[PDB]
Amino acid sequence: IVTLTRFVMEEGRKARGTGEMTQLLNSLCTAVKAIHRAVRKAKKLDVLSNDLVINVLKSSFATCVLVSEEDKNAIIVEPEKRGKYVVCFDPLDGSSNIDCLVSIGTIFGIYRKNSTDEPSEKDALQPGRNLVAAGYALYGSATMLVLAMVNGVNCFMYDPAIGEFILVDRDVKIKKKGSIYSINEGYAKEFDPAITEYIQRKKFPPDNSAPYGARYVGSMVADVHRTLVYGGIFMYPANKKSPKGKLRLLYECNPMAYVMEKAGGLATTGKEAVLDIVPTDIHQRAPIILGSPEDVTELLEIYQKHA
Amino acid sequence: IVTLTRFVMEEGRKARGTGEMTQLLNSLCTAVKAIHRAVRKAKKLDVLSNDLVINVLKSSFATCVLVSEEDKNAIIVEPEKRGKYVVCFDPLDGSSNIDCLVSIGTIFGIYRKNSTDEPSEKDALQPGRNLVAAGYALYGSATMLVLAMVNGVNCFMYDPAIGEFILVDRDVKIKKKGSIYSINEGYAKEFDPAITEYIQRKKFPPDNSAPYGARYVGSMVADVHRTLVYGGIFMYPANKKSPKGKLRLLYECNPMAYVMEKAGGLATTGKEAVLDIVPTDIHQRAPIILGSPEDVTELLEIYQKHA
Amino acid sequence: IVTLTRFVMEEGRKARGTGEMTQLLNSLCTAVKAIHRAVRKAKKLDVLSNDLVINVLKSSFATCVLVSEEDKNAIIVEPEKRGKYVVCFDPLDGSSNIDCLVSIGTIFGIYRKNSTDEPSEKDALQPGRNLVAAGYALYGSATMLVLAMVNGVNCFMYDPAIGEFILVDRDVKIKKKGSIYSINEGYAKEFDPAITEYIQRKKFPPDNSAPYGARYVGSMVADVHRTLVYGGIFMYPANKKSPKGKLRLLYECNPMAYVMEKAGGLATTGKEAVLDIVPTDIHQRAPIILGSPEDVTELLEIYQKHA
Amino acid sequence: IVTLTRFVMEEGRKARGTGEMTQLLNSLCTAVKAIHRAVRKAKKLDVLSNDLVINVLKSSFATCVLVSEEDKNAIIVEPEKRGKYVVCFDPLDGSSNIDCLVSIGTIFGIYRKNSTDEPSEKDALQPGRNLVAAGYALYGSATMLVLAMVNGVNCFMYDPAIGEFILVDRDVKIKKKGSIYSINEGYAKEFDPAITEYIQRKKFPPDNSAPYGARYVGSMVADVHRTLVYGGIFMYPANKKSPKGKLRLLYECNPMAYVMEKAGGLATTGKEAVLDIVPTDIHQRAPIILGSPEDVTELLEIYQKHA
Ligand SMILES: O=P(O)(O)OC[C@H]1O[C@@](CO)(OP(=O)(O)O)[C@@H](O)[C@@H]1O
Ligand SMILES: O=P(O)(O)OC[C@H]1O[C@@](CO)(OP(=O)(O)O)[C@@H](O)[C@@H]1O
Ligand SMILES: O=P(O)(O)OC[C@H]1O[C@@](CO)(OP(=O)(O)O)[C@@H](O)[C@@H]1O
Ligand SMILES: O=P(O)(O)OC[C@H]1O[C@@](CO)(OP(=O)(O)O)[C@@H](O)[C@@H]1O
Ligand SMILES: [Mg+2]
Ligand SMILES: [Mg+2]
Ligand SMILES: [Mg+2]
Ligand SMILES: [Mg+2]
């Protein structure tokens, strides 16, 4: 009934909209499709996707700065194709899961260039709550674009048949409480006491209750998605070893914090809202705790308690 | 260069082969393709796939009894289409992961009907080491058929482009030791002491070493595959609560035990080789511990030790 | 390297462009894709395609009036989705060729609504040289969008793989003279003397020469395309029996006259340029003679001569 | 409901069947699929397809000699992969129609090697009525395999979705009389008097009647198919200039004569049944007149009359 094309544009009418967004979302989708295709019949793959997003974004004529998980230095579009947009992406998230055919995907966040000053990285270093829009594409089982703007969150399923994305749920809102905790527990020797105490509670309900089911796919987007659609909680915390956890703020953490918050979720470092943290590096990491609010809250209480 | 079609047939030449197998593998693949297709643009889905495997298998003219995770009672093909083969399948494995687009798949095992007696369930109740061939199809990221016969293990990638499966690795052999433990740890309050003691060791290496990474996707085939191609260990043990664990022997446990053993892996209940257990029910469960031999061994030592 | 998306938009930048076009071409393409898909695995089909073009065009928000070969009465979009554009289409051209899997396609022409008056058919009744843009999609062998605006003519090939159209030739220009005449000769008893005399010349070169090859596929777009890319001439003339020939002016004749003229071709009724004829009916027919200029000219000379 | 796979095999059961056929039809189909794919997103293409048919046929292990329109000399499979079958194919028929996206296809005929003598061309030089089976694949609009064995004629539609061919009509039988004559009339100066007199009758019905519609797509298979499913007549006769017409007997003429005869059609040189002509060259041409019997008969009467 409704393509992402129709949908985006119908939002642009809504906002007397720049629609510079539209071109941009449009190029983006072209990419996602290109990736879905490379992936579905396949670290070059890591690399292939990068270029694609970089190229399509350039030609969108709607972006000025690009931040890629896969690139040392931020990219500024040569002037002719310049756009008022700044885009940070994890081109395909889940290196580890590439070779064993586990779900992988693309995460992206869009900021409006606020700077009058010629576009520079500094343009990328804004807090997550400046995002104009954020989303991800998940290539597993099926492809799914999850787009989230100020309005709320909307899921579109890719139909390889007609080469379009198609609204399935819009908008989405996450269960207030869930049954699934997602964290890499090998790092158990390293976890702060709040996490630890927290994990135990999930395995040994004090109020006798069922213990949470545990899932960790290994791909952020896969885990973040399951989280979004099923409810529950997802964790990549700091350990003694990585002070700021492992997941980067620009292309991994904020988009998902955003998606999560717009869905009525929550996303904290354990000490603060992820969106509200203003970065000092285009490549900085940040502990992330997201998902059903009731659940994230429960853990925040531990953190508060332990300090 | 080589389709599964060419490949199977080139094995049939090898064995002066019945090739009743060929028709059967062939119908099977037709199915996998049908499923890949339903899944990639989608519990009816659970149900849809069932029929497909049931129908294509019937029309193969090479099977007599069918055991399906999804059916209360075993199926015996009406006589005209009868075949000397008995096939047990989990039509799509990972109900829980269906809706959130995590990798799912099909597991299957093929036994030759030994019984002179008219085909009955009893035909299905053989030990895993009577399997003629066993395999699975994994719909995530990409599709992949993993076929394993007496010869060894071979991976074919589905190419949606020409509608064929195509050899990528053949045969496969698993790393002797790995870095990844896969188990649902919510059930931690229930785990026997050997598991427990075992999990700790992975998180707190006594020989100071890196602690294993942990992954649990939620789908058996997804986990079993990652295990196969990356090395490591996968666990669904009995707890106090489920005496014989959760995974069924016919369609989930044995195929994977087989795939695993033919790949040079290992697969124990913790007390015995999974293949070597002769079932009393077409729907019985069985604790399963598989993957890199060195790893499974390490845990077997715990089990032995604790008894 | 270049999608139709990128391309269209890069023209819109060029013209400070309305880009209301872009949305429109975009919806159009969505359709073509939908049709390609229905067709490639298939008079309902005639009917299915109609709706698709009608719906996608409505939702484009860029059209006011629609003229369809398949509809008795012109369609005016309900006001909210109104656009400054008027679109006439043969939704799929070649009814006769549907069932026997011969190439079929979609022909379309876009006019800017000039009328201040509320949109009415009269909005459709303009001469072909008022077209803003015209084109067709050809579903045979491969899919191909041929888009032609004031600039010139450009061919994009559909890639079912990523669900995009991709520039292959742009712009196109037709050979000045060709080797192939295309006309349904069963109607030979009916042809005016100029056609007749003309056909003979092709079969019996007076300047001893090779006689033209003859092709008539049965689908206008198929024939018009072969004509465009190979050179030669295509004919659907009036006979005694159909005074104004068989092909309709709005959705069949003008788009192709346009495509042809922008490619440096020619398109006459035999008495006048097809574009320059101002219609009195949204469903009127008109004799059409198009293709390589040298060839069309040769026949015009006959016509002049015989009058 | 029914794949070509199931169907072929269900014929092999029927005939206690060699099923060496099955492997062969199976490899064949693999090819057709490969070609459909190359074609649908594209003289290399002429050449690409050749190899594919050559390779897949070799690996079928069911053919000894191959005759290809595209190869000067007949091919004999290196001994290990030898089969009792001889296959003559036009790998893709309609060179002229390749670049302008008009329907193209593959024509093939299968003979059982009768010769005790080591396989040599002489193995290919049999009359058309020795064909074991004959068919074609048509890539236009949609893909369609038309398989015809002693039983009768059956049409399978390729479904790019699951990568299978699927029965749509089986068997087929052609209308006794039709409304469409198909011939390249540029060659009109060359046509024998019987053709000429014949063509006129179609344009000027003596019994006042409608004159036949005329279609000539340019691709043999396209024309032959339209003919088969719609009825009518198709002609590539000898002229003064080409004594034996243009179409080759092994890979173009006989398969279609066969398909046509098994469908209840007719196929004559004008002087004799095409099947009944025993060739002296793997690359020889032969005038062909096929299609609805009543129609072909009408023309045979002319031929008889004029001699
Ligand atoms: O290996 P662990 O510690 O689980 O880290 C996994 C995380 O890293 C990410 C981020 O990049 O993938 P990967 O490192 O494999 O590229 C996420 O997809 C995932 O959530
Ligand atoms: O929910 P938990 O206890 O992890 O059980 C998951 C296991 O069950 C299986 C077996 O059926 O899936 P599911 O129950 O979701 O159908 C496996 O795919 C998976 O390994
Ligand atoms: O049947 P004839 O007289 O050849 O008319 C064919 C013409 O009609 C058209 C126009 O609609 O197709 P059809 O009538 O089969 O729908 C053109 O595609 C084609 O050029
Ligand atoms: O060019 P004309 O004389 O029509 O010959 C066309 C015939 O030749 C064939 C046979 O090869 O195609 P082509 O020559 O273009 O390769 C047939 O498909 C078609 O029927
Ligand atoms: Mg990443
Ligand atoms: Mg299951
Ligand atoms: Mg039409
Ligand atoms: Mg040919």
PDB file of C-alpha atoms in Angstrom, chain C residues 36-37 39-42 95-104 138-144 157-161 168 181 183-189 202-205 208 211-219 222 225-226 229-230, chain D residues 36-37 39-42 95-104 138-144 157-161 168 181 183-189 202-205 208 211-219 222 225-226 229-230:
ATOM      1  CA  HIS C  36       7.602  -5.474 -14.626  1.00  0.00           C
ATOM      2  CA  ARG C  37       7.081  -7.774 -11.738  1.00  0.00           C
ATOM      3  CA  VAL C  39       4.335  -9.327 -16.102  1.00  0.00           C
ATOM      4  CA  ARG C  40       7.428 -11.336 -15.615  1.00  0.00           C
ATOM      5  CA  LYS C  41       5.566 -13.919 -13.790  1.00  0.00           C
ATOM      6  CA  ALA C  42       2.089 -13.986 -15.252  1.00  0.00           C
ATOM      7  CA  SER C  95      -2.943  -6.648 -25.673  1.00  0.00           C
ATOM      8  CA  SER C  96      -2.590  -9.095 -28.498  1.00  0.00           C
ATOM      9  CA  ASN C  97       0.973  -9.967 -27.375  1.00  0.00           C
ATOM     10  CA  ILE C  98       0.169 -10.439 -23.704  1.00  0.00           C
ATOM     11  CA  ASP C  99      -0.659 -14.151 -23.780  1.00  0.00           C
ATOM     12  CA  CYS C 100       2.134 -15.304 -26.117  1.00  0.00           C
ATOM     13  CA  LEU C 101       4.921 -13.695 -24.068  1.00  0.00           C
ATOM     14  CA  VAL C 102       5.945 -11.151 -26.712  1.00  0.00           C
ATOM     15  CA  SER C 103       7.437  -7.841 -25.503  1.00  0.00           C
ATOM     16  CA  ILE C 104       4.903  -5.409 -24.033  1.00  0.00           C
ATOM     17  CA  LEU C 138       9.535  -1.854 -22.392  1.00  0.00           C
ATOM     18  CA  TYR C 139       9.210  -5.190 -20.784  1.00  0.00           C
ATOM     19  CA  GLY C 140      10.881  -7.522 -23.160  1.00  0.00           C
ATOM     20  CA  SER C 141      14.162  -9.331 -23.001  1.00  0.00           C
ATOM     21  CA  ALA C 142      14.956  -6.842 -20.377  1.00  0.00           C
ATOM     22  CA  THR C 143      13.200  -3.869 -18.970  1.00  0.00           C
ATOM     23  CA  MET C 144      14.096  -0.465 -20.235  1.00  0.00           C
ATOM     24  CA  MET C 157      17.906  -0.346 -17.920  1.00  0.00           C
ATOM     25  CA  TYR C 158      16.009  -1.829 -14.994  1.00  0.00           C
ATOM     26  CA  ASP C 159      18.138  -3.902 -12.698  1.00  0.00           C
ATOM     27  CA  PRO C 160      15.768  -6.241 -10.879  1.00  0.00           C
ATOM     28  CA  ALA C 161      18.706  -6.873  -8.590  1.00  0.00           C
ATOM     29  CA  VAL C 168      22.837   2.964 -20.358  1.00  0.00           C
ATOM     30  CA  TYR C 181      10.220  -1.278 -42.326  1.00  0.00           C
ATOM     31  CA  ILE C 183       3.935  -2.302 -40.655  1.00  0.00           C
ATOM     32  CA  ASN C 184       1.004  -4.777 -40.381  1.00  0.00           C
ATOM     33  CA  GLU C 185       0.603  -5.722 -44.017  1.00  0.00           C
ATOM     34  CA  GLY C 186      -2.563  -7.777 -43.681  1.00  0.00           C
ATOM     35  CA  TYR C 187      -4.263  -4.505 -44.109  1.00  0.00           C
ATOM     36  CA  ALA C 188      -2.752  -4.363 -47.489  1.00  0.00           C
ATOM     37  CA  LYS C 189      -6.044  -4.359 -49.296  1.00  0.00           C
ATOM     38  CA  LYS C 202      11.203  -1.359 -49.958  1.00  0.00           C
ATOM     39  CA  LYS C 203      10.710  -4.851 -51.505  1.00  0.00           C
ATOM     40  CA  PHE C 204      11.910  -3.897 -55.020  1.00  0.00           C
ATOM     41  CA  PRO C 205      14.656  -1.259 -54.690  1.00  0.00           C
ATOM     42  CA  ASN C 208      19.295  -1.733 -57.127  1.00  0.00           C
ATOM     43  CA  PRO C 211      15.411  -4.611 -49.974  1.00  0.00           C
ATOM     44  CA  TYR C 212      14.611  -3.560 -46.441  1.00  0.00           C
ATOM     45  CA  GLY C 213      14.180  -6.225 -43.779  1.00  0.00           C
ATOM     46  CA  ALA C 214      10.661  -6.318 -42.420  1.00  0.00           C
ATOM     47  CA  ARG C 215       9.675  -6.576 -38.757  1.00  0.00           C
ATOM     48  CA  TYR C 216       6.364  -6.169 -37.026  1.00  0.00           C
ATOM     49  CA  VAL C 217       6.260  -7.355 -33.498  1.00  0.00           C
ATOM     50  CA  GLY C 218       2.688  -6.308 -32.761  1.00  0.00           C
ATOM     51  CA  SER C 219       3.495  -4.098 -29.806  1.00  0.00           C
ATOM     52  CA  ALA C 222       8.543  -2.875 -29.061  1.00  0.00           C
ATOM     53  CA  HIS C 225      12.004   0.911 -29.755  1.00  0.00           C
ATOM     54  CA  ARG C 226      13.641  -1.397 -32.266  1.00  0.00           C
ATOM     55  CA  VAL C 229      17.880   1.938 -31.484  1.00  0.00           C
ATOM     56  CA  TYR C 230      18.345   0.264 -34.925  1.00  0.00           C
TER      57      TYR C 230
ATOM     58  CA  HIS D  36      17.458 -15.943 -18.382  1.00  0.00           C
ATOM     59  CA  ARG D  37      19.501 -14.166 -15.818  1.00  0.00           C
ATOM     60  CA  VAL D  39      19.689 -11.733 -20.619  1.00  0.00           C
ATOM     61  CA  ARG D  40      17.388  -9.997 -18.267  1.00  0.00           C
ATOM     62  CA  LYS D  41      20.048  -7.688 -17.234  1.00  0.00           C
ATOM     63  CA  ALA D  42      22.279  -7.192 -20.235  1.00  0.00           C
ATOM     64  CA  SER D  95      20.877 -12.316 -32.866  1.00  0.00           C
ATOM     65  CA  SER D  96      19.245  -9.430 -34.625  1.00  0.00           C
ATOM     66  CA  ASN D  97      16.812  -8.946 -31.698  1.00  0.00           C
ATOM     67  CA  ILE D  98      19.409  -9.091 -28.945  1.00  0.00           C
ATOM     68  CA  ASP D  99      20.262  -5.389 -28.778  1.00  0.00           C
ATOM     69  CA  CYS D 100      16.727  -3.980 -29.103  1.00  0.00           C
ATOM     70  CA  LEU D 101      15.312  -6.060 -26.235  1.00  0.00           C
ATOM     71  CA  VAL D 102      12.952  -8.144 -28.379  1.00  0.00           C
ATOM     72  CA  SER D 103      12.131 -11.686 -27.183  1.00  0.00           C
ATOM     73  CA  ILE D 104      14.937 -14.211 -27.679  1.00  0.00           C
ATOM     74  CA  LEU D 138      11.636 -18.224 -24.551  1.00  0.00           C
ATOM     75  CA  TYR D 139      12.905 -15.213 -22.777  1.00  0.00           C
ATOM     76  CA  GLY D 140      10.368 -12.583 -23.503  1.00  0.00           C
ATOM     77  CA  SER D 141       7.728 -10.994 -21.365  1.00  0.00           C
ATOM     78  CA  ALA D 142       8.273 -13.945 -19.194  1.00  0.00           C
ATOM     79  CA  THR D 143      10.353 -17.029 -19.439  1.00  0.00           C
ATOM     80  CA  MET D 144       8.768 -20.196 -20.643  1.00  0.00           C
ATOM     81  CA  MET D 157       6.687 -20.909 -16.763  1.00  0.00           C
ATOM     82  CA  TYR D 158       9.887 -19.875 -15.019  1.00  0.00           C
ATOM     83  CA  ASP D 159       9.345 -18.348 -11.631  1.00  0.00           C
ATOM     84  CA  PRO D 160      12.425 -16.253 -10.907  1.00  0.00           C
ATOM     85  CA  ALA D 161      11.114 -16.181  -7.365  1.00  0.00           C
ATOM     86  CA  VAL D 168       1.047 -23.976 -16.863  1.00  0.00           C
ATOM     87  CA  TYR D 181       0.784 -15.303 -41.039  1.00  0.00           C
ATOM     88  CA  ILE D 183       7.078 -14.282 -42.682  1.00  0.00           C
ATOM     89  CA  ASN D 184       9.851 -11.752 -43.520  1.00  0.00           C
ATOM     90  CA  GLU D 185       8.375 -10.161 -46.612  1.00  0.00           C
ATOM     91  CA  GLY D 186      11.361  -8.045 -47.593  1.00  0.00           C
ATOM     92  CA  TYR D 187      12.436 -11.102 -49.403  1.00  0.00           C
ATOM     93  CA  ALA D 188       9.399 -10.718 -51.491  1.00  0.00           C
ATOM     94  CA  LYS D 189      11.291 -10.241 -54.699  1.00  0.00           C
ATOM     95  CA  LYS D 202      -3.972 -13.923 -46.929  1.00  0.00           C
ATOM     96  CA  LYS D 203      -4.172 -10.193 -47.864  1.00  0.00           C
ATOM     97  CA  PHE D 204      -7.052 -10.569 -50.368  1.00  0.00           C
ATOM     98  CA  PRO D 205      -9.365 -13.356 -49.148  1.00  0.00           C
ATOM     99  CA  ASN D 208     -14.567 -12.688 -48.727  1.00  0.00           C
ATOM    100  CA  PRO D 211      -7.425 -10.931 -44.208  1.00  0.00           C
ATOM    101  CA  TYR D 212      -4.978 -12.549 -41.837  1.00  0.00           C
ATOM    102  CA  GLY D 213      -3.110 -10.378 -39.352  1.00  0.00           C
ATOM    103  CA  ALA D 214       0.607 -10.353 -40.002  1.00  0.00           C
ATOM    104  CA  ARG D 215       3.346 -10.698 -37.386  1.00  0.00           C
ATOM    105  CA  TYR D 216       7.051 -11.241 -37.705  1.00  0.00           C
ATOM    106  CA  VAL D 217       9.010 -10.693 -34.587  1.00  0.00           C
ATOM    107  CA  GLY D 218      12.397 -11.677 -35.986  1.00  0.00           C
ATOM    108  CA  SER D 219      13.114 -14.411 -33.482  1.00  0.00           C
ATOM    109  CA  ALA D 222       9.112 -15.994 -30.479  1.00  0.00           C
ATOM    110  CA  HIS D 225       5.604 -19.763 -29.954  1.00  0.00           C
ATOM    111  CA  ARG D 226       3.025 -17.132 -30.814  1.00  0.00           C
ATOM    112  CA  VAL D 229      -0.368 -20.757 -28.570  1.00  0.00           C
ATOM    113  CA  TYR D 230      -2.452 -18.526 -30.925  1.00  0.00           C
TER     114      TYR D 230
END
